[PDB]
Amino acid sequence: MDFDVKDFGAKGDGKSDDTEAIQAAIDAAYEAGGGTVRLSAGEYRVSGGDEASDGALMIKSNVYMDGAGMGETVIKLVDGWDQKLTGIIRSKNGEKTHDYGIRDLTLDGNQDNTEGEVDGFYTGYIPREDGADYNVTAERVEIREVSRYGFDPHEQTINLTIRDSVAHNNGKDGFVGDFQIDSTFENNVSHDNGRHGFNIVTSSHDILLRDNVAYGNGANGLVVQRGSEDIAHPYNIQIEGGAYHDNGAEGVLIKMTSNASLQGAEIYGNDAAGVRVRGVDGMQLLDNDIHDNAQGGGKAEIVLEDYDDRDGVSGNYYETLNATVQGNRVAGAAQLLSSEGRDLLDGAAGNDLLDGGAGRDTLSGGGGADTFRFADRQDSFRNYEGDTSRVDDIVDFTPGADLIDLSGLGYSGLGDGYNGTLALLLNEDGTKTYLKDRQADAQGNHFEIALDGNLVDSLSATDIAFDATQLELLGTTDLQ
Ligand SMILES: O=C(O)[C@H]1O[C@@H](O[C@H]2[C@H](O)[C@H](O)[C@H](O[C@H]3[C@H](O)[C@H](O)[C@H](O)O[C@@H]3C(=O)O)O[C@@H]2C(=O)O)[C@@H](O)[C@@H](O)[C@@H]1O
Ligand SMILES: [Ca+2]
Ligand SMILES: [Ca+2]
Ligand SMILES: [Ca+2]
Numbered sequence: 001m002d003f004d005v006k007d008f009g010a011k012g013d014g015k016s017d018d019t020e021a022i023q024a025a026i027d028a029a030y031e032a033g034g035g036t037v038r039l040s041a042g043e044y045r046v047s048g049g050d051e052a053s054d055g056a057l058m059i060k061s062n063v064y065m066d067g068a069g070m071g072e073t074v075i076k077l078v079d080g081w082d083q084k085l086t087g088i089i090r091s092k093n094g095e096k097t098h099d100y101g102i103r104d105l106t107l108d109g110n111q112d113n114t115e116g117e118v119d120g121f122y123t124g125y126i127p128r129e130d131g132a133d134y135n136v137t138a139e140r141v142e143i144r145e146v147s148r149y150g151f152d153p154h155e156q157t158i159n160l161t162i163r164d165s166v167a168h169n170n171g172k173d174g175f176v177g178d179f180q181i182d183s184t185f186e187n188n189v190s191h192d193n194g195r196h197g198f199n200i201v202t203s204s205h206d207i208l209l210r211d212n213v214a215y216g217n218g219a220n221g222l223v224v225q226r227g228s229e230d231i232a233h234p235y236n237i238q239i240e241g242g243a244y245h246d247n248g249a250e251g252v253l254i255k256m257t258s259n260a261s262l263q264g265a266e267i268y269g270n271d272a273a274g275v276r277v278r279g280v281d282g283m284q285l286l287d288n289d290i291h292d293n294a295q296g297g298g299k300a301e302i303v304l305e306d307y308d309d310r311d312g313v314s315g316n317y318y319e320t321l322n323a324t325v326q327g328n329r330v331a332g333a334a335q336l337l338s339s340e341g342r343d344l345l346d347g348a349a350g351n352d353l354l355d356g357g358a359g360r361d362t363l364s365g366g367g368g369a370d371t372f373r374f375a376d377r378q379d380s381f382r383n384y385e386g387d388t389s390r391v392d393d394i395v396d397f398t399p400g401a402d403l404i405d406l407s408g409l410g411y412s413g414l415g416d417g418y419n420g421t422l423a424l425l426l427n428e429d430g431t432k433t434y435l436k437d438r439q440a441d442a443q444g445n446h447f448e449i450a451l452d453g454n455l456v457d458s459l460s461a462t463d464i465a466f467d468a469t470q471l472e473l474l475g476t477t478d479l480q
């Protein structure tokens with residue numbers, strides 16, 4: 001059931017306030033049980049209501065607004081509006097609005113000629129209560145010149161899809177997904193916004209971010225994060241393809257998140273690290289193309305690190321855990337640090353720092369001069385019964401180029417494996433070389449590292465840093 005805004009008195013002349021006419025069309029479509037509100041090419045001026053939560057236009061269940069195309073149909077806020085306006089198009093607070101959407105139109109926040117925080121598209125039910133909008137679609141929508149958030153789908157929305165859309169020149173974030181669930185952001189561009197290209201926050205989970213592009217933003221290209229409150233972390237965030245480039249901060253930042261994945265993206269020209277991972281439990285960083293970042297200074301293309309929130313709202317320390325970093329092309333240093341559990345950490349052409357922490361890790365440096373750090377004797381060991389399920393292995397150690405950093409472990413040098421020395425040994429068939437502490441500790445464990453290949457004759461004392469002085473002399477990276 002199609003309704004034309006023109007038939008309800010909308011002028012689309014750039015001067016008349018068409019808010020009531022477009023709302024009438026929306027209400028007629030809703031009362032018929034659903035329909036498409038069509039808008040022909042033209043600039044429609046709209047105004048807010050008594051309160052910020054009134055937005056400007058109130059979309060309703062089973063109503064879809066179809067324009068004549070981005071740039072053709074433009075919905076613009078009136079000159080002189082001076083009130084906070086939370087959603088130029090929005091669904092109602094306190095209602096579980098469903099099966100609605102917007103296509104082929106532009107929202108213009110008119111921040112130049114207005115004052116107050118304005119958001120373009122706002123969805124959701126009630127902050128901090130159970131309940132959700134659901135089945136929400138934005139297709140080929142452009143949102144520009146709002147003073148705060150362009151696309152601002154909010155808590156909670158299930159099965160939001162935003163595809164083939166653009167957010168640009170907004171005051172804060174182009175796209176913000178607040179407690180989005182089972183939702184899809186595909187083939188979008190967010191550029192030249194005041195802060196973030198994309199910001200996934202507030203417990204969002206099962207999100208696919210496929211083939212999105214973020215550039216020229218004042219802050220991150222994409223950030224996935226808990227947010228400032230003590231609430232459940234986001235989880236199951238899959239970022240595939242796209243490009244995150246020339247932003248004012250990190251290209252992609254992921255923090256206080258569980259089961260995040262970043263695969264096949266191009267990440268370049270950012271002012272800070274290309275990829276930064278802070279306190280993430282389950283991180284896959286696969287097959288990306290990462291180069292020419294840290295333009296504003298900084299030593300690393302990729303940073304894996306913890307997130308210490310002990311002085312913050314949660315009181316918790318969050319380790320990065322369960323990391324898989326493989327197949328990336330990285331023209332610069334990767335800092336690949338993780339902790340308890342099995343990590344697979346592959347460096348790239350740069351001079352990388354690798355430390356899988358506790359648990360059995362498999363490390364490779366790739367090209368360049370890499371440092372494999374072992375920070376605790378309990379991070380790589382054989383137990384009293386000879387079980388090797390906690391012995392780390394280094395895949396491609398290159399004597400004369402790479403370095404094993406044992407500077408915190410209190411061994412003196414190579415030797416017979418007793419009295420604080422480590423023994424350099426080959427296995428029976430000559431396929432693996434070991435560094436062994438032959439002295440069991442009180443729990444019966446032996447520090448041990450396995451190295452692929454036969455290195456008993458090529459590996460020497462200058463390939464291992466046994467104390468801080470040796471580390472200063474021999475360290476291969478800018479990261480210690
Ligand atoms: O998490 C936030 O704080 C979130 O709040 C959003 O504004 C909400 C606001 O929090 C509140 O729920 C308000 O509720 C109004 C309701 O809309 C209606 O006017 C009712 O008569 O009174 C309620 C009230 O006074 O509590 O609705 C706001 C809304 O805009 O839906 C946004 O500001 C968001 O940016 C922020 O993160
Ligand atoms: Ca709603
Ligand atoms: Ca202004
Ligand atoms: Ca580990």
Ligand SMILES: [Ca+2]
Pocket residue numbers: 347348349350351352365366367368369370
């Ligand atoms: Ca390397």
Ligand SMILES: [Ca+2]
Pocket residue numbers: 365366367368369370398401402
């Ligand atoms: Ca190397």
Ligand SMILES: [Ca+2]
Pocket residue numbers: 356357358359360361379380392
């Ligand atoms: Ca380990």
